[PDB]
């Protein structure tokens, strides 16, 4: 299980106190091989009425609706994946779908418009890399926590625009800092080589966030 | 309290 592996990876790095290093050698912990294929580039919280809309870095759009269904529009602009409450995955198109799915598709297009016109694409400088959906999300005062169906957990921090993408299959983390510089690390190498105070702080917070996901299944 | 990602 991805989240459990992630909790272990984060305990291990954090128990090592990586910032309390005489000689921090954070560069030697980079692993460009573990760069994620997918992360969330943009999002819009319309959850008080409809759901949470988001764009992945491949330009695909998705919505986790309030009724616990999910609609994914692929980056071709017409292919859909729909996920009913019982988890049934199906392939459809905007051009050919059930009539009952019109309100949802209309909503997705509205959200996609807002996101396309007004929001910045996180990680737009990065060349990445099956298509994950948003399993669950929540917000704190500090951050939004997005858990994708491929096991990845992304945590975006509001105040300083820093972000973590935690990749349990690679035991890795990608950190996008205040400068929009994107660096991908193997967590066990952060244990050996150490890291800056700011990243160690975000990793401590990340473990609390994975605790919250594991405790709210 | 942002209701969307970075503009």
**How close does chain B come to A136, measured CA to CA in Å?**
17
Cβ neighbours of B7 in A, within 8 Å: 118-120
A179: Cβ contacts below 8 Å, ≥ 6 apart: none
How far is residue A151's CA from residue A133's CA, in Å, rounded to a whole number? 10
**Contact at CB, A45 and B7, closer than 8 angstroms:** no
Give all strands of the β-sheet with A51-56 in edge-to-edge order: A40-46, A51-56, A61-65, A70-73, A79-83, A89-93
**Resolution reached, in Å?**
1.6
- The vertex-A52 CA angle with A51 and A54, nearest 5°, equals 140
Chain A: residue whose CA lies nearest to B5: A43
How far is residue A135's CA from residue A69's CA, in Å, rounded to a whole number? 10
Q: How many CB atoms lie within 10 A of CB A94?
A: 17
Q: SS3 sequence, chain A?
A: CHHHHHHHHHHHHHHCCCCCCCCCCHHHHECHHHCCCCCEEEEEEECCCCEEEEEECCCCEEEEECCCCEEEECCCCCEEEEECCCCCEEEEECCCCCHHHHHHHHHHHHHHHHHHHHCCCCCCCCCCCCCCCEEEEEECCCEEEEEECCCCEEEEECCCCCEEEEECCCCEEEEECCCCCEEEEEHHHHHHHCCCHHHHHHHHHHHHHHHHHHCCC
- The tally of CA atoms less than 13 A away on the side-chain side of residue A178 is 5
Q: Using CA of residue A141, residue A144, residue A147, residue A153, what is the dihedral sign?
A: negative
A122 inside 8 A of chain B by CB:
yes
**Contact at CB, B6 and A122, closer than 8 angstroms:** yes
**Contact at CB, A120 and B7, closer than 8 angstroms:** yes
How far is residue A12's CA from residue A7's CA, in Å, rounded to a whole number? 9
Give all strands of the β-sheet with A172-176 in edge-to-edge order: A134-139, A143-148, A153-157, A163-167, A172-176, A182-186
SS3 B2: coil
Burial of A8 (0-12, 13-18, 19+ CB in 10 A): middle
SS3 B4: strand
How far is residue A148's CA from residue A7's CA, in Å, rounded to a whole number? 16
Do A64 and A52 meet the contact criterion of CB atoms below 8 Å apart?
yes
Count of pairs with CB atoms under 8 A, one residue in A, one in B: 29
**Contact at CB, B6 and A161, closer than 8 angstroms:** yes
Burial of A4 (0-12, 13-18, 19+ CB in 10 A): exposed
Closest alpha carbon to A133 in A74, A193, A175, A190: A74
Both structure tokens of A201:
């702080």
How far is residue A171's CA from residue A50's CA, in Å, rounded to a whole number? 34
CA distances from A189 to A103, A177, A211 (A): 48, 19, 23
How far is residue A72's CA from residue A79's CA, in Å, rounded to a whole number? 8
**Contact at CB, A114 and B4, closer than 8 angstroms:** yes
Question: Chain A neighbours among B 1-7 (CB < 8 Å)?
Answer: 1-7
Cβ neighbours of A42 in B, within 8 Å: 4-5
Closest alpha carbon to A124 in A199, A182, A52: A182
**Contact at CB, A118 and B5, closer than 8 angstroms:** no
How far is residue A215's CA from residue B3's CA, in Å, rounded to a whole number? 25
> What was the experiment behind these coordinates?
X-ray
Q: Which domains can be identified in chain A, with CATH numbers?
A: 1-40+132-217 (3.30.1120.30), 41-131 (3.30.1120.30)
**Contact at CB, B4 and A161, closer than 8 angstroms:** no
β A79-83/A163-167 pair status: unpaired
Cβ neighbours of B6 in A, within 8 Å: 119-120, 122, 161
| Out of A41, A42, A158, closest to residue B2 by CB | A158
Residue with tokens 């205040």: A178
């Amino acid at each position: 299980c991805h989240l459990s592996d992630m909790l272990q990876q984060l305990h291990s790095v954090n128990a090592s106190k990586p910032s309390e290093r005489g000689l921090v050698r954070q560069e030697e912990a980079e692993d460009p091989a573990c760069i994620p294929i997918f992360w969330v580039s943009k999002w819009v919280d319309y959850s008080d009425k409809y759901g949470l809309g988001y764009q992945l870095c491949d330009n695909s759009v998705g919505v986790l609706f309030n009724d616990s269904t999910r609609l994914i529009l692929y980056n071709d602009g017409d292919s859909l994946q729909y996920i009913e409450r019982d988890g049934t995955e199906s392939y459809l198109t905007v051009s050919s779908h059930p009539n009952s799915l019109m309100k949802k598709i209309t909503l997705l297009k509205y959200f996609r418009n807002y996101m396309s016109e007004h929001l910045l694409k996180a990680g737009a400088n990065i060349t990445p890399r099956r298509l994950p959906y948003l399993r669950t999300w929540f917000r704190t005062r500090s951050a939004i926590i997005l858990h994708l169906s491929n096991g990845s957990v992304q945590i975006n921090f509001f105040q300083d625009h820093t972000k973590l993408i935690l990749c349990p299959l690679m035991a890795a983390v990608t950190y996008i800092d205040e400068k929009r510089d994107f660096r991908t690390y193997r967590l066990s190498l952060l244990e050996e080589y150490g890291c800056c105070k700011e990243l160690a702080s975000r990793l401590r917070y990340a473990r609390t966030m994975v605790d919250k996901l594991l405790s709210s299944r | 309290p942002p209701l969307h990602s970075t503009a």
